[PDB]
């Protein structure tokens, strides 16, 4: 007669169970029929960090299926713009043509994909509606004003290294209005595309189309969008007297804060969230009996890091909206019968 | 609208309305698993399970077997609605939290 409703207990030789006991018929009384108000009451989102290119909200009180749906949407279904075709007029570089096209596909563009649309199948030409064109034209020459020196930038250098700065947007249609001068640009100005020696030249036109990270990774808008369940650490016994420090070393260092309540030293669990699961207490043989570390049941921690095309919060919003769009597409196709 | 990027339903042996297999095209484990989680909350369904037919293909099979009365197409169309309601609520809550944090940080 003992219920544990909220944690995923764990030892070393394996974890105890894979359930969450929050579904219909999963208890004598604790049965579920998807009370929507109970959800709307027990759900809360907290936002720990939000630099540019980072977010770490909490998303407390949701199941693993919905959290995983959100994570898989950001990685593979939120749309981005990226180079699909490369027209090469001349290329006397050491970098091949196909390898140059590949390298150009993996460069992130700062166009927002919500103002564009998908190219129809076999729309090779493209129009202001679905495409953005950029041009890289660079040639390397020796600089006339150079002494007998060997630094590659000083001599043998007008364009020794071709960067993303060298790529220039060719406004395709009326896109010069709508897009102000600096808005459509590659996100990073320092990505090394190639290297040149005097007499070598690159000249090409790149076409960027819309697409999702599912049919090619180049179109994916986040470095990673993973999540982790909130750890839980409980001191079953008061640790003290120089075993507190050994305890504080078997964890990521901020988790067990050793206070000094009396002349003796007491270890306390200051911040369970910092913990990385390393299970190094389980090697102690005397303190594996003192601490129980498990996971909180439906308390997640998310971390979204965008490449630079869209801000992270906008990414999460568009992910939730893409899931809603899936649901609505299937609802309206069902209503079609 | 789309005759086959979307739904194809196969009523079972005897065309039992209470046992249907929906084929959802262009879907992977994301919608499959979230929708199966949302359809399991209905006490009127006795068996819900999804599965991907083959890696090379892009389509899932849901199987809903409901109790004696309802035609097993209401559980599906209600799991869809509840999942979309949950997504709308999560979106509202997340945007409100982001706004509140932006204000708290821009003030200080």
């Amino acid at each position: 007669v003992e219920e544990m409703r909220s944690r995923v207990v764990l030892g070393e030789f394996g974890v105890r169970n894979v359930h969450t006991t929050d579904f219909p018929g999963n208890y004598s009384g604790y049965d579920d029929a998807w009370d929507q108000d109970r959800f709307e009451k027990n759900f809360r989102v907290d936002v720990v960090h939000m630099d540019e290119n980072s977010l770490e909200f909490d998303m407390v009180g949701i199941d693993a299926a919905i959290a995983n749906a959100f994570r898989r949407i950001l990685l593979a279904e939120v749309p981005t713009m990226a180079v699909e075709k490369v027209l090469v007029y001349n290329n006397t570089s050491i970098v091949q043509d196909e390898i140059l096209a590949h390298r150009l596909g993996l460069i992130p563009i700062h166009a927002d994909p919500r103002l564009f649309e998908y190219r129809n199948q076999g729309d090779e030409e493209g129009t202001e509606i679905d495409t953005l064109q950029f041009r890289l034209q660079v040639r390397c020459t020796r600089n006339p004003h150079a002494a007998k020196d060997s630094s590659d930038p000083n001599e043998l250098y007008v364009n020794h290294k071709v960067y993303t700065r060298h790529m220039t947007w060719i406004p395709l249609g009326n896109q010069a209005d709508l897009f102000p001068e600096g808005t459509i640009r590659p996100v990073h100005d320092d990505i090394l595309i190639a290297q040149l020696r005097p007499g070598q030249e690159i000249d090409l036109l790149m076409h960027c189309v819309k697409g999702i990270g599912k049919d090619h990774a180049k179109f994916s808008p986040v470095a990673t969008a993973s999540y982790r369940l909130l750890p839980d650490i409980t001191l079953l016994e008061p640790v003290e007297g120089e075993a507190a420090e050994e305890l504080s070393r078997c964890f990521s260092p901020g988790v067990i804060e050793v206070q000094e309540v009396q002349g003796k030293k007491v270890a306390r669990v200051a911040n369970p969230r910092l913990d990385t699961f390393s299970r190094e207490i389980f090697r102690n043989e005397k303190l594996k009996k003192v601490v129980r570390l498990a996971r909180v049941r439906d308390h997640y921690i998310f971390s979204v890091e965008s490449t630079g095309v869209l801000p992270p919060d906008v990414l999460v919003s568009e992910a939730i909206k893409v899931l809603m769009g899936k649901c609505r597409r299937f609802l309206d196709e069902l209503d079609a019968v | 609208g789309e005759r086959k990027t979307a739904l194809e339903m196969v009523q079972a042996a005897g065309t039992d309305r209470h046992c249907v297999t929906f084929v959802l095209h262009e879907e992977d484990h994301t919608l499959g698993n979230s929708l199966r989680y949302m359809i399991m909350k209905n006490p009127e369904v006795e068996f819900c399970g999804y599965t991907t037919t083959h890696p090379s293909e892009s389509k899932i099979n849901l199987r809903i077997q409901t109790r004696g009365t309802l035609p097993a197409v209401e559980p599906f169309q209600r799991g869809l609605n509840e999942l979309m309601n949950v997504c709308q609520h999560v979106l509202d809550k997340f945007e409100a939290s982001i706004k509140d944090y932006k204000d708290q940080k821009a003030s200080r």
Partner: peptide
Amino acid sequence: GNPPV
């Protein structure tokens, strides 16, 4: 590290 203060 710790949701917003």
